[PDB]
C-alpha cells in the first residue's frame, strides 16, 4: 500500500483545492475512503452549503486591531477555537500516520483527538505529541471489561477527556467504499482485542458490526464513572439527545453528522446547531463539526452557539501532501483565515464571535 | 420483442444506477415506456426531490439492536413495510415477465399486486407466486358484467384485496412514448375481453380509452359489495378524495401519482402525503408510492403517515437485469437499507418509524 | 426575406419543441425577433417557470366523461377558453402571414386579435377570417385624428372589441434584435400614416417611438367613447392598474408582460394574476397571457382568476412550420391538451376549471 | 514593473454591461484584468451581489401620463445628470494607459461626480486635467500617523474635493483567490500617498475627519444598520452602502439585500449612496426605490475604460442613463423622486424561480 512519505509546508489558498491535490498522491481506495460520504453524497453537499444559510456582516469603525484567537476549554489553553477531530487510520493518507498529525497539532497548540480505530499505537502517537494535550475517542466493545481496559490505557497515555461517538452503531451507505471494495490495509492496534485478530483485510462494516450496537444512556453514565474523566457525546443532531446526554453525566456536547459519512438524507450539520445550543443553554461546552473549511465557518459556528469546532478532512489532505508540516500548514491557514474574519467583523477576541449578529438568507445556495 | 432472459442476482449499491444498467439490455421502446413520465418529466424529478424536504435525524444512545422490519397490513404478515406495485406488462422488462416478479416477491415475503394490464395469465402468475399473498388491481371496463367477471376470476386465483386505480381515466402525455410511437408487443389476457381484439399493437392511450372514463364513487361501493374484499382506492393526491373514498366504503387509501406518468405539472407525491394522512385520521390503512428509491424514503413515508410503501421501477429494472433473482436482489437491498436506517434513527421496529421527527428543509434540493 | 411557404398539418408533441424546429426554416433575424425577449431573458424564463409555483391535483371518482372546452366571452361562443393574441409582422414566420393565422383561428372557432403592426391590410386578413370574430389591437398614434381614423377602419372591418396595448410606450431592451441590427423587411399598412415613411427598414424602437408615449387614463375613456366598443387594457401586472382601467371605462383586463419582451427584471406574468383577479372581483372579464404552453397552464390560469388566455409564440412557430394548417395544429393541440387535463383534474366544463384547488410549491423550480 | 494596458481611445456600443467583462479580458493583461474582475473566496458573495436584484422585481405601470422622463438629480449641492456617480477605485492604469484621468474625463463630460481613491495611479494634477473643472470627492484610506491624514485631506481640499469618503471595510484585505493564485503584484506606485494602514479605526476617526476637513464625510462599506447609527452620530453627512464589490468580506450577503434595513434606520437623516453589483438601469431604479439616493458604478466603467479610454467609459455612463430612462418610462416614473416611491414585487423563489 503505497502511502506518501514526503514532508514539507504547503501553500493553502483555500482548503477545497487540497482534496483534488491529495487525490494525486494518495492510493485510490484510501483516498476515496477519506473523501467520500453516504449515498450520492447530498448530505455532504448540505454540510458545505449550510454555511450560506447564515451570512456574516462586515462591521466598520469597531476599534479593533490584531484580533486574538486564543481560547480555553476544560482548562486547556489553545491557540485557536478549533481542535483536531478523531479520524481513523491516518496511515491511509501518509506513512508517518497519526504521529504526523499529532506533531502538527501539538506544535500548532491545540488538542489532538485520538480515534479508537487509529492505525498507530498510543506509544507512537505520544512521541509525536510530546506532552501536548490529547482527548480519546472510543468506539465501544460489546464486552464491558474490554471498555474498562481501553479507557484505562487511554488515561495512562494522558488523555484529559473521553469522546463517545454514538452515531456509528452500523456503517453508513458509503457507495465509494462499496464500489472500490475497500478494506483496511493495516491493523488497528487499540481495538483489535475485540475484532480478535487483525483489522487488516476487514471492511468498515464488520468493524462497526463488532463494536457496540445497543448503546443506551447507561453507557454514558458508566464511562463517566470509570474513566473519572469528562465525557463528550459526539454525533448529535437532535436537541433531545443533548438533554439525554447531559442528564446521563456528559460534560460536553459534540454536534456532528460524522462529516456526512453516516446517516444519509439528513440535514447539514451547521443547520442543527442553533437548536442544540438553545437546548444546552450553556450547561456544558459545545464542540461543532462536519463541514468546516473556512475561517468564516469557525466564526459562524461560534456565533451560533459552538464554543469550539473540530477540523477533519482538510487536515488529512494537508497530511497527505506534506506530512506533519502539510497538516500544520492547514492549521496555520485556519488561524490566519479566522484572524482576517475577526478583523472585518469587529471581533477583538473569541467571545466577541460568539456574540455576532448573522444575516439570515432564506434563498439558500443559488440565492 | 427482444426481452432479456438471463437470470441472476446482482449487486445493488443503490437503485438509481439500475436505470442506466437496464437501458443497455432492454430494447428502446419498452425501456422508455418504463423509465419515462408525463411531459418533460419535471413531476417525476419532483417525486425524487420531495424526499429532500423532510430529513431524518440521527439518534444516539437509543438502546436499539437488530431492528425488526416486519409489519402487518389487512391480515398479512410481511417481512418489511413494502409491497410490490401494480405494474403492467413486465414482459417489456424480461422474458419471464410477471412470473419472475411474482417469484421474487413471494420468496422475499411480501404482497404482490397484479395489474389488470398484466402480460401474463392469472395461472402463470400463480406458478410464480407459489402460494404467496396477492392483491388484484383493476382497470375497470365500461360493461358491468365484465367487471364482475374479472373481479370473480381475481378472487378465484386468491386475491385478498382489490385495488381501484382511478387516476388513469385517460393517459398522461408521455412524450417518450409518443415520439417512439410505442405500442405493446404482446396481449393482455385479463382485459382483452373489452378491447378491439388483442392489446398487442395498441397504444396505452386507446387501452385506457376502452376502460371506464366516468368513474364515480358508486363504483367503489359496487366493487366492495360485489367482491366482498377490501378495496383500496389508488392515485390519490388530494385529501377530499381520501374522505370520499372512505365514505364510499374503501378499506384502504393508496397515495399515488402513478410514478409521475399521469397528470403533469403536479406535486411530488411525498409532499402530498401529510395532508392526506391527516384527513384519513387513522380510519383505514394507507399505502404510499411514487418515487421510493432508498431505505430513507421508506422511513420518511411511514413517519409522514403511511403504513407501508409500494415499490415500482426499481424492481422492474432489477427484473430486467436478472429475472426473479435480479428483482429479489432489489427487494433484499430495500430491506437491508431500511434496517440500517432504523438503527441510526433509533427505531427498534416499524411502529417506531411512524413516530419519527423530521427536519423541515425549506431550502429544497440545492440547499 | 425568405419566409416559409409550405402549408400542412404537423405533429405537436409539446409546444416547446416547435421553437427549435421553426429555427431551421425561419431567417435568423426574424426568428430571433420572434423568439427573444428583454435582457438575458430571465423574465421570459420566469414566465415559464411560474407555472411550477401552483401545481394541479389529480382528482378521482369525479364522475366526468368527455369534457367540454367550449366557453363564451363578451357574447362570443368559442371552442376553448383561449384566443389568439395580437402579434405583429406574421410575415416573418410565414408568407401567408396574418391571413394564414386568421384562417387557422377562424376554422378552429376562436377569436383573432389583429395587431396594429400587422403586415397584412384589413382586407387581406378579413379574407382568411371568412366572417370569424376579430378584436383590433391599437398602438396609439400621437395624433388624435389618426386614432379616430384607425378605430373607424377597425370597426368597419368588423372588430367587436378594442385592445389597448399600453405596456410599450418605449421598447423593451431586446438584446437579440440589437445584436442582429434587426429591422422589418416589409411595410405595416395600418400604422404607416404616423411613421415618417414605411415601417420597412425601421427598428421597433423608432416605430414604438412614433406611437404615443404619454398614454393617460383619458386615452381609455376616449377609445371607448369614439369606438362604442368594449375596450380591453393590455399589459397589466399591478392590481392598481386594473382599478384604474375599470375606473376609466375598460370592459376588460388583459394581464400580460408582453411575453417578457418589454420591462426586464420583472415577475413571471402568472405570479401577478391572483392579486389582479382579487382587485377586479368579477367586475369585468380577464384575459391572461405571457407564457402559455400547455393545457395545464390554461387550467391554472383559469383556476387563478382568468376567464380565457391568449396564445402567442407557439401559434407562430406553428405558422412557420405549416402556415394556416400548422397554426391550426397548435390550436387543436391546446384543445386536446386541456381536454386531458380537465378529465384528470375532474373538470366537466370550463366553469369547473375556475374553481380548482392548486397546490402551493414554495420550493419553486428546482424543488 | 512591466504593465501594458491598452491605449486605444474609442466609443463602443454597449448592449449590456455583462458582455464587457469578457470583451475586456481580451485586451487587458491577465494579472491586472483578474485583479479588477475577481473577488473573495470562490466569489459566491459577488454572485450574491448580482442575484439580489432578482429578489425585488419591477412592475410595469400603464396609463401613467408619462413622457421624456428626467434622470437629473441633486446631492449635497451637486447637480448631476443621473442618480449615479463614479465609485472610488484604485489603479485605473490596470485598465487603460490614460489611467484615472481617462475616467475623470468621461465622468466630467457626462456630468456627475468623480470619486478619487487615495491609492490612485495618478496625481491630483493629472486627474484635474481630465476633470476639467468638474466635481470631485476624495476617498481616504487612513494612515496610522495623524499628520499624514491631515496632510492628505488638506491636499484634497486643495484640488477642490467637495466631500470626503472614508472607506472602513478594508482594515485588512479580502481573501482574493485570483490575486494569490496569479501572484499578482501591484505594478505602479501611489503618488498621493507615501501596508501600515490604520487597523484600529474607531468612531472618533469620523469626528476628526469631519472636524479637520470641514467637508461632508461619507462612511463607506456599511452593510449593518447599527453602523449607520454609529456614523451619523459621529458626524457623517452621508452613508455609503457597499461591500466593496465583494473584494472584502466573504460569505456575506449581496449588498442590495442589506439596503432596506439600513434605509429604515437612517430615516433620511443623511443621503445614501449605494453600491456593489450595479449593472442595469433596472438596478439603479431598485436601489432608489429601496431607500438609496444615488448609486456608485465601478467594474463596468473600468471595463469600458479598458476597451476605449475616456470614450468607452463615457459610452457606459451614457448606456446607464438611457437604460434608466427606458425603465422610468415603463415603470411610470417621470423624475428621480418617483423612483424612490416605486412598489416592488417580492420574489421568495430566488434566482432560479
Ligand atoms: C476519513 C475519516 C475518518 C473518520 N474517523 C472517525 C473515527 O474513527 N471516529 C469518529 O468519532 N469520527 C470519525 N470521523 C468523523 C470526524 O470526527 C468528523 O466528524 C468529520 O471529519 C467532520 O467532517 P469534515 O471532516 O468534512 O469537516 C471521520 C471522518 C473522516 C472523514
Ligand atoms: C412501467 C409502469 C407500469 C405501471 N402500470 C400500472 C398499472 O398497470 N396499474 C396501476 O395501477 N399502476 C401502474 N403503475 C404505477 C405503479 O403502480 C406505481 O404507482 C409507480 O410505479 C410508483 O412510482 P415509482 O415506480 O417511480 O416509484 C405503473 C408504473 C410504471 C412505472
Ligand atoms: C413576435 C411577437 C410580436 C408581438 N407583437 C405584439 C403586438 O404587435 N401588439 C401587442 O399588443 N402584443 C404583441 N406581442 C405580445 C403578445 O400579445 C403576448 O402578450 C405574448 O406573445 C404572450 O407571450 P407568449 O407568446 O410567450 O405566450 C407580441 C409577442 C411576440 C412574441
Ligand atoms: C479593482 C477594484 C478596486 C477598488 N478600489 C477601491 C478603492 O481603492 N477604494 C474604495 O473605497 N473602493 C474600491 N473598490 C470598491 C468600489 O468603490 C465599489 O465599492 C465596487 O466597485 C462596487 O462593485 P461593482 O463595481 O462590482 O458594482 C474597488 C473595486 C474594484 C473592483
Author numbering:
A (entry chain C), B (entry chain A), C (entry chain B): 8 to 374
D (entry chain D): 6 to 199, 216 to 374
Paper quotes:
Crystals of the Y215F mutant grew in the P21 spacegroup and had two tetramers within the asymmetric unit. Also present in each subunit is the FMN cofactor and a pyruvate which both bind in a similar manner to the wild-type enzyme. Residues 200–215 in subunit D and 200–216 in subunit H, which reside in loop 4 had no corresponding interpretable density. These residues form a short helical structure, which could function as an active-site lid, and residues near this range have been observed to be disordered in other structures suggesting an inherent mobility. In the six subunits with observable loop residues, the pyruvate is bound in a manner very similar to the wild-type enzyme except for a difference in the interaction with the amino acid at position 215. The interaction in the enzyme variant positions the nearest Phe215 ring atom within ~3.5 Å of the pyruvate methyl group to replace the hydrogen bond with a hydrophobic interaction. The hydrogen bond with Arg181 is also lost. In the two subunits without observable density for the loop, the pyruvate maintains some of the interactions between its carboxylate and Arg268 and Arg181 but shifts in the pyruvate and both of these side chains result in weaker interactions. The k5 of Y215F (20.3 s−1) at pH 6.5 was lowered 7-fold compared to the corresponding k5 of the wild-type enzyme (141 s−1). Evidence that k5 was nevertheless slowed down in the Y215F variant compared to wild-type enzyme at pH 6.5 could be explained by the development of new interactions between Phe215 and the bound pyruvate.
The Aerococcus viridans L-lactate oxidase (avLOX) is a biotechnologically important member of this flavoenzyme family and it catalyzes oxidation of L-lactate and O2 into pyruvate and H2O2. Common characteristics of their structure are the (β/α)8 barrel fold and arrangement of protein subunits into a functional homotetramer. The FMN is bound at the C-terminal end of the internal β barrel. A special and interesting feature of the catalytic center of avLOX is that it contains a third tyrosine (Tyr215), which forms a weak hydrogen bond with the pyruvate O2 in the wild-type structure.
